[PDB]
Design a protein around this motif. Structure first.
Motif, PDB file in Angstrom:
ATOM      1  N   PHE A 224     -10.565 -16.613  34.599  1.00  0.00           N
ATOM      2  CA  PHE A 224     -11.181 -15.098  33.751  1.00  0.00           C
ATOM      3  C   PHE A 224     -10.429 -13.790  33.193  1.00  0.00           C
ATOM      4  O   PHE A 224     -11.019 -14.476  31.649  1.00  0.00           O
ATOM      5  CB  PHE A 224     -12.092 -14.621  34.161  1.00  0.00           C
ATOM      6  CG  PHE A 224     -13.363 -16.008  34.447  1.00  0.00           C
ATOM      7  CD1 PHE A 224     -14.188 -16.384  33.356  1.00  0.00           C
ATOM      8  CD2 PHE A 224     -14.013 -16.069  36.159  1.00  0.00           C
ATOM      9  CE1 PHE A 224     -15.432 -17.194  33.379  1.00  0.00           C
ATOM     10  CE2 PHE A 224     -14.916 -17.293  36.039  1.00  0.00           C
ATOM     11  CZ  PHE A 224     -15.156 -17.625  34.683  1.00  0.00           C
ATOM     12  N   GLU A 225      -9.047 -13.452  33.613  1.00  0.00           N
ATOM     13  CA  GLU A 225      -8.354 -12.298  32.628  1.00  0.00           C
ATOM     14  C   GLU A 225      -8.062 -13.185  31.454  1.00  0.00           C
ATOM     15  O   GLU A 225      -7.120 -11.992  30.445  1.00  0.00           O
ATOM     16  CB  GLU A 225      -7.345 -12.278  33.461  1.00  0.00           C
ATOM     17  CG  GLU A 225      -6.261 -12.736  33.401  1.00  0.00           C
ATOM     18  CD  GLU A 225      -5.195 -12.323  34.873  1.00  0.00           C
ATOM     19  OE1 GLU A 225      -3.754 -12.842  35.245  1.00  0.00           O
ATOM     20  OE2 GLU A 225      -4.958 -11.231  35.154  1.00  0.00           O
ATOM     21  N   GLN A 226      -7.128 -14.460  31.306  1.00  0.00           N
ATOM     22  CA  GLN A 226      -6.784 -14.982  29.768  1.00  0.00           C
ATOM     23  C   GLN A 226      -8.358 -15.352  29.179  1.00  0.00           C
ATOM     24  O   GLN A 226      -8.261 -15.366  27.420  1.00  0.00           O
ATOM     25  CB  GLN A 226      -6.783 -16.190  30.297  1.00  0.00           C
ATOM     26  CG  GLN A 226      -5.827 -16.350  31.305  1.00  0.00           C
ATOM     27  CD  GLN A 226      -5.221 -18.219  31.591  1.00  0.00           C
ATOM     28  OE1 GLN A 226      -5.245 -18.573  32.414  1.00  0.00           O
ATOM     29  NE2 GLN A 226      -4.578 -18.252  30.233  1.00  0.00           N
ATOM     30  N   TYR A 227      -9.244 -14.498  28.972  1.00  0.00           N
ATOM     31  CA  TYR A 227     -10.542 -14.475  28.068  1.00  0.00           C
ATOM     32  C   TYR A 227     -10.381 -12.816  27.801  1.00  0.00           C
ATOM     33  O   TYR A 227     -10.348 -12.730  26.409  1.00  0.00           O
ATOM     34  CB  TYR A 227     -12.114 -14.611  28.803  1.00  0.00           C
ATOM     35  CG  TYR A 227     -12.048 -16.479  28.818  1.00  0.00           C
ATOM     36  CD1 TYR A 227     -12.893 -16.836  27.416  1.00  0.00           C
ATOM     37  CD2 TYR A 227     -11.989 -17.132  29.743  1.00  0.00           C
ATOM     38  CE1 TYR A 227     -12.406 -18.594  26.985  1.00  0.00           C
ATOM     39  CE2 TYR A 227     -12.035 -18.785  29.904  1.00  0.00           C
ATOM     40  CZ  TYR A 227     -12.575 -18.718  28.993  1.00  0.00           C
ATOM     41  OH  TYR A 227     -13.260 -20.749  28.729  1.00  0.00           O
ATOM     42  N   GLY A 228      -9.813 -11.598  28.557  1.00  0.00           N
ATOM     43  CA  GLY A 228      -9.829 -10.773  27.755  1.00  0.00           C
ATOM     44  C   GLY A 228     -10.215 -10.074  29.774  1.00  0.00           C
ATOM     45  O   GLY A 228     -10.507 -10.288  30.022  1.00  0.00           O
ATOM     46  N   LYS A 229      -9.703  -8.606  29.253  1.00  0.00           N
ATOM     47  CA  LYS A 229      -9.621  -7.390  30.188  1.00  0.00           C
ATOM     48  C   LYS A 229     -10.403  -7.291  31.139  1.00  0.00           C
ATOM     49  O   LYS A 229     -11.587  -8.098  30.360  1.00  0.00           O
ATOM     50  CB  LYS A 229      -8.744  -6.343  29.582  1.00  0.00           C
ATOM     51  CG  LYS A 229      -8.819  -5.147  30.755  1.00  0.00           C
ATOM     52  CD  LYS A 229      -8.522  -3.712  30.303  1.00  0.00           C
ATOM     53  CE  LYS A 229      -7.770  -3.181  31.610  1.00  0.00           C
ATOM     54  NZ  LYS A 229      -9.476  -1.976  31.929  1.00  0.00           N
ATOM     55  N   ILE A 230     -10.677  -8.016  32.421  1.00  0.00           N
ATOM     56  CA  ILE A 230     -11.669  -7.852  33.226  1.00  0.00           C
ATOM     57  C   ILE A 230     -12.092  -6.019  33.840  1.00  0.00           C
ATOM     58  O   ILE A 230     -11.117  -5.188  34.328  1.00  0.00           O
ATOM     59  CB  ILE A 230     -11.247  -8.451  34.856  1.00  0.00           C
ATOM     60  CG1 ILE A 230     -11.454  -9.755  34.374  1.00  0.00           C
ATOM     61  CG2 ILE A 230     -12.860  -8.262  35.531  1.00  0.00           C
ATOM     62  CD1 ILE A 230     -11.253 -11.323  35.026  1.00  0.00           C
ATOM     63  N   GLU A 231     -13.401  -6.005  33.856  1.00  0.00           N
ATOM     64  CA  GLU A 231     -13.413  -3.973  34.724  1.00  0.00           C
ATOM     65  C   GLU A 231     -13.793  -4.473  36.061  1.00  0.00           C
ATOM     66  O   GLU A 231     -13.024  -4.234  36.692  1.00  0.00           O
ATOM     67  CB  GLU A 231     -14.658  -3.962  34.003  1.00  0.00           C
ATOM     68  CG  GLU A 231     -15.378  -2.212  35.063  1.00  0.00           C
ATOM     69  CD  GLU A 231     -16.510  -1.762  34.293  1.00  0.00           C
ATOM     70  OE1 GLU A 231     -17.310  -2.427  33.352  1.00  0.00           O
ATOM     71  OE2 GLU A 231     -17.370  -1.793  35.274  1.00  0.00           O
TER      72      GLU A 231
END
Length: 181
Positions: free
Chosen positions: A118-125
């Protein structure tokens, strides 16, 4: 060629001075534009304050989204993946949602597996792997909250998601109790 709807951005919060031409001159930097339009009133020709830009590929859309904030005619605009005319006749079609439900992960999937994917889609909170309050056993689902709504928009348009050798069910989540269609 990729369906046009997946190669298109809705550009909100435009200055009323922005035209099809100045919008094209801005967005041309990130790829080949196949269409560029500012929506206007049919009688006064006054800008409606939004438009659409269509790129030749999905990777060009990603490049333009990765270049945010976009300053167009002295204003920071609000680009979002364009929802089709049919899909816009759904409640909350345009709501910005930052959380997803990921189901079908079973008991062997760990936080690092969800993060590396999922981090490849964007920054994770946050990544929250769900457990039963009584037994402490993994329930086989997780919630992933992103820093940016575009991460969720990229995810939900994919037909399939595989994490740690499992084919997952992925949906937008309004909360840890309500998930979207």
């Amino acid at each position: 060629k990729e369906p046009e709807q997946l190669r298109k951005l809705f550009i909100g919060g435009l200055s009323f001075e922005t035209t099809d031409e100045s919008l094209r001159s801005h967005f041309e930097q990130w790829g080949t534009l196949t269409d560029c339009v500012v929506m206007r009133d049919p009688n006064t020709k006054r800008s409606r304050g939004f438009g659409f830009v269509t790129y030749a590929t999905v990777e060009e859309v990603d490049a333009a989204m990765n270049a945010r904030p976009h300053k167009v005619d002295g204003r920071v605009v609000e680009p979002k993946r364009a929802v089709s005319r049919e899909d816009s006749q759904r409640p909350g079609a345009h709501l910005t949602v930052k959380k997803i439900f990921v189901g079908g992960i079973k008991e062997d999937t760990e936080e690092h597996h969800l993060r590396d994917y999922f981090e490849q889609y964007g920054k994770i909170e946050v990544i929250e792997i769900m457990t039963d309050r009584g037994s402490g056993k993994k329930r086989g689902f997780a919630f992933v909250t992103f820093d940016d709504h575009d991460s969720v928009d990229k995810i939900v348009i994919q037909k399939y998601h595989t994490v740690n050798g499992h084919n997952c069910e992925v949906r937008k989540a309004l909360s840890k109790q309500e998930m979207a269609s």
